A = this chain, B = another copy of it.
Amino acid sequence: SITENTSWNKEFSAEAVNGVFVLCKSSSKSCATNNLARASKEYLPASTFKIPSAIIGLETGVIKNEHQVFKWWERDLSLRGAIQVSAVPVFQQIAREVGEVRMQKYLKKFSYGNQNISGGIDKFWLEGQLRISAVNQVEFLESLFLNKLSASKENQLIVKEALVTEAAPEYLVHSKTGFSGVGTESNPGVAWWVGWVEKGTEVYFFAFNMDIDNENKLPLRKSIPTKIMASEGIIGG
């Protein structure tokens, strides 16, 4: 079962950040985390929801294929482009096109978090009632990696390639950020970084989230997990 790794807390203590890193080698049956309690806590996914949303976009035909171009003077974006930027409008538009009933059906098939899309079809993952844990992110990414989600293998492949963010001779990193917004310290915002690294014949799944009350701490969402994975010899510093 998910085991606790106290050594990783040092990277959090260094920056005085409250949050969780879940890292799994080969499968979701071999995970480790610095914070047992927090690993299972559900938080708004924010832009990490672009992962299921792009898959359902393709599956429903709202996104024609991997070459779909998205309008925002306004330069158009590729699917990878729309994933990376804050194309708030892009993914708001794809969700409206998909619509409540189809979105609900796919989130139930994907076992995505609390599966609650209340709060507005074009904003539920930003302002709505949707919540998901770090553990559930890894399990979903593992299903994507194995082409086991309820979607064609071609559409899962198309989203896997669009998520590539770092390539090296030895490994490819697929990842996605997310940020709810700063909040108050009665209700701190949440920042995320989730993904997986194919290194040789091995695969590592990861999911990070943290409390964030100032936009200046945004970089930590990638530097903390990168320092941890660099320590394990998975990716370069």
Contacts and interface: CB of A to CB of B under 8 A. Distances in A.
B157 A161 contact: yes
Interface in A144-164: 146, 153-154, 157-158, 160-161, 164
Contact of A198 (B80, B146, B158, B198): B80
A81 interface: yes
A29 interface: no
A157 B78 CA distance: 16
A172 interface: yes
A117 interface: no
- Within the oligomer, what is the number of copies of this chain? 2
Nearest to A203: B67
Contacts of A67: 146
Interface string A161-172: 100111101101
A201 B80 CA distance: 9
B200 A77 contact: yes
Nearest to A162: B172
Contact of A167 (B157, B158, B164, B200): B164
Given A154-B154, A167-B166, A167-B167, A78 B161 contact: no
Nearest to A161: B161
A75 B200 CA distance: 9
19 contacts: A66-B157, A75-B200, A75-B201, A76-B201, A77-B201, A78-B198, A78-B200, A81-B201, A84-B169, A153-B154, A154-B157, A157-B157, A157-B158, A161-B161, A161-B164, A164-B167, A164-B172, A165-B167, A166-B167
- In order of increasing CB-CB distance, the 3 nearest A-B pairs are A167-B167, A157-B157, A161-B161
